[PDB]
Amino acid sequence: DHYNCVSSGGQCEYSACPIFTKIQGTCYRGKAKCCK
Numbered sequence: 001d002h003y004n005c006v007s008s009g010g011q012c013e014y015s016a017c018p019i020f021t022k023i024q025g026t027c028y029r030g031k032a033k034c035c036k
Contacts, residue, residue, distance in 0.1 A: 001025075001026070001027060002027040002028060004025070004034075005025060005026075005027050005034035008036070009036065010024065010025070010034040010035055010036040011034070011035045011036075012027030012028060012032045012033070012034055012035075013027075013032055013033050013034075013035050014028075014031065014032045014033075017033060017035030018035060021035040021036055022035065022036070023035060024036045
């Protein structure tokens with residue numbers, strides 16, 4: 001979720017993860033990806 005994604009160094013993103021990161025979990029009631 002948003003809290004855990006931010007706490008663990010990820011970024012919540014609605015669209016493709018920024019370069020050199022990838023999906024690992026979700027944010028925003030499941031509508032976004034946690035990119036790490």
